[PDB]
């Protein structure tokens, strides 16, 4: 009957299974989950500054369509487009639509710097029944519809603006594509318009095209929206003999620096989370996640797996 | 494990060990009792916590990205915008799968090492006064009261004390 001293290790009744290099199912005492699979279902307004267009997409907000009155001068870290956003104004298309909405979303600002232009020899502030603001004919709040002098000519526009500031100016303008040769002559008196916006280093010129388009808001015509950037020291020139949709100023090109747009339908709650997704916010300390590939902020890295168990204990052998 | 102590010559674990990860379990004249071992338990936890902290450092923070969902076919550009994201997700998924499997293989080997570490420490303590039964227990060839047992567990056991009794009981 000699004394014996034994050496061992702890164990538990129900252990956790983990993967290793040499086995798919090894039971260990304790393990932590590294893949986050849950979300709040609401977008947390902290610490990221959010902006809800909530009836207006970003571009409609930049142009100033009826619904987007609340978006003026807004600043954001994340703009939020909704699926319920609706066009409300004269029908328009935007060549390279995703590029101009990704410039407005990076800049993270709808601050419109208003400027006074002198469109010599044209009627101004035209409105359309397809763009109603309070049951009344309106237009884009940041665009000026120019038509011929009342019973007169479309005096040739040669307006210029020099960028004196230290920032890059983003000008939003457009070109009206009439529906019939009557409308063209009824509005600008030329048989064929022309819009040429230019800087010293880049230019763009458009001659409109008459024809029938599907009726949108009882309108068969269209407005093609364009944009021109102006660097400090450069000058922009709006030259047109017809069909010009003039600007009312410019936007300020800001720095990306957590500025983007997220297309979601979830309500903005009162929570706090440094990570947003299209499916809501993520609150976790885990490295990975299977919530959504769309992730904005300090987020876990999106993976395909739904569970990756890291072993935090020895081999469990009861 | 690479050392074959846990799930090896140590048959199974002790569920009565709730105050530590590694422990002693003796049988002397006065009776029987179990005590955890702090040093071995702490060394294992430090290396698990150490690799846990390494895996949490929040380094991923992007805001402006490329679109990852599309409401109309476009062709060349959309194909690329998709293929770029798919390529990234696959690579990160591999980076995660390999990380977990590798860290676990190391984790299990670390805990199997610390168990053998403790055993080898006690082996060197007695060092002619006991013998390795094989199951992780030492047959102490001398009377070892509770004060003697504690001396083995807090590292003050002087083998020269019992060397004369122990060798005699072993050889004959």
């Amino acid at each position, epitope marked *: 009957g000699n004394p014996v001293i034994c050496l061992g290790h702890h164990a538990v009744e129900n252990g956790t299974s983990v993967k290793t290099l040499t086995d798919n199912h090894i039971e260990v005492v304790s393990a932590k989950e590294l893949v986050e699979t849950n979300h709040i279902n609401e977008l947390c307004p902290s610490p990221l500054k959010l902006v809800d267009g909530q009836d207006c997409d970003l571009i409609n907000g930049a142009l100033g369509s009826p619904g987007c009155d609340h978006l003026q001068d807004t600043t954001w870290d994340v703009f939020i487009e909704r699926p319920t956003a609706m066009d409300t104004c004269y029908p328009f298309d935007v060549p390279d639509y995703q590029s101009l909405r990704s410039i407005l979303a990076s800049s993270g600002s709808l601050e419109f710097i208003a400027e006074q232009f002198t469109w010599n020899g044209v009627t101004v502030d035209g409105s359309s029944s397809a763009c109603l603001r309070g049951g009344r004919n309106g237009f884009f709040t940041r665009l000026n519809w120019l038509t011929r002098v009342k019973n007169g000519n479309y005096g040739p526009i040669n307006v210029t603006k020099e960028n004196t500031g230290s920032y890059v100016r983003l000008y939003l303008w457009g070109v009206h594509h009439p529906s019939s040769d009557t409308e063209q002559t009824d509005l600008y008196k030329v048989a064929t318009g022309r819009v040429t916006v230019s800087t010293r280093s880049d230019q763009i010129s458009i001659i409109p095209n008459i024809g029938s388009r599907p009726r949108v808001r009882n309108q068969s015509g269209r407005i093609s929206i364009y944009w021109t950037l102006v660097n400090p020291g450069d000058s922009i020139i709006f030259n047109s003999i017809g069909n010009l949709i003039a600007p009312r100023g410019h936007y300020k090109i800001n720095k990306s620096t957590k500025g983007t747009v997220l297309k979601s339908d979830k309500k903005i709650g009162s929570c706090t989370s440094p990570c947003l997704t299209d499916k809501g916010s993520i609150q976790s300390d885990k490295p990975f996640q299977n919530v959504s590939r769309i992730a904005i902020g300090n987020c876990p890295k999106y993976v395909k797996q739904g569970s990756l168990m890291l072993a935090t204990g020895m081999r469990n052998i009861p | 494990g690479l050392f074959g102590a846990i799930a090896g010559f140590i048959e199974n674990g002790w569920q009565g060990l709730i105050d530590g990860w590694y422990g002693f379990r003796h049988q002397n004249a006065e009776g029987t009792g179990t005590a955890a071992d702090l040093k071995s338990t702490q060394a294992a936890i430090d290396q698990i*916590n*150490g690799k846990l902290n390494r895996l949490i450092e929040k380094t991923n923070e992007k805001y402006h990205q490329i679109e990852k969902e599309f409401e109309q076919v476009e062709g060349r550009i959309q194909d690329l915008e998709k293929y770029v994201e798919d390529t990234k997700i696959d690579l990160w998924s591999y980076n995660a799968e390999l990380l977990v499997a590798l860290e676990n293989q190391h984790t299990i080997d670390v805990t199997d090492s610390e168990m053998n570490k403790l055993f080898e420490r006690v082996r060197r303590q007695l060092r002619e006064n006991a013998e390795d039964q094989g199951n992780g227990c030492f047959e102490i060839f001398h009377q070892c009261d509770n004060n003697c047992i504690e001396s083995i567990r807090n590292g003050t056991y002087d083998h020269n004390i019992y060397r004369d009794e122990a060798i005699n009981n072993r050889i004959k």
Partner: antibody
Amino acid sequence: QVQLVESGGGVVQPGRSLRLSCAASGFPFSSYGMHWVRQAPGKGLEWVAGVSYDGSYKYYADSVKGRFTISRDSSKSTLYLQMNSLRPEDTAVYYCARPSAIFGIYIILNGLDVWGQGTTVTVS
Amino acid sequence: EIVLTQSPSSVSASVGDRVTITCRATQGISSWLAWYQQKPGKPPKLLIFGASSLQSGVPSRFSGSGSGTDFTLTISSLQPEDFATYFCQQAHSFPLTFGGGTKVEIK
């Protein structure tokens, strides 16, 4: 829900004895080791005593070794701090504290999760 | 023993300042440090265990750092209720050591 209640603190003369008690509630007391930590009034926290889960291994501070005696009871789930040979150095606000459980083990040597309200011991 | 040394011993700051505190010991106490909050007349509350692991329910502004030799308790955006005295704890081996206290006053 889970908390620790202290008691026993009174006014006592040097050289005599007292017994302070710490009743647990809302957790498996007999599974955790436990600690007594005293905040000398004016100074910071000063660990004084600690005991294992079973009660066979007891750890004391060098200032109270052979003078104070810790003990516990599974049947009442209570922690006893039997103080003998008191002196004004031992004047302090006594706290019974619970070392944190880590991973799966209820270690005795860790940070302290739960504290009692604080029962003051005055020695004139 | 192991001797802890909190620096500074006291500090005054306004709400919203980047507060930094240090715990400083002798031995290799690996990663065993526990920071505590303490209001006057009240028992401590565990803020950080493992010297970096945030305690459950504690706001994310409290953060801990350090390993082995040099330790640090950082607070990003101080709040009115965060006015308190702070203690660090050694937990590598017995006996348990605490610090001299680092109180945050009003500026």
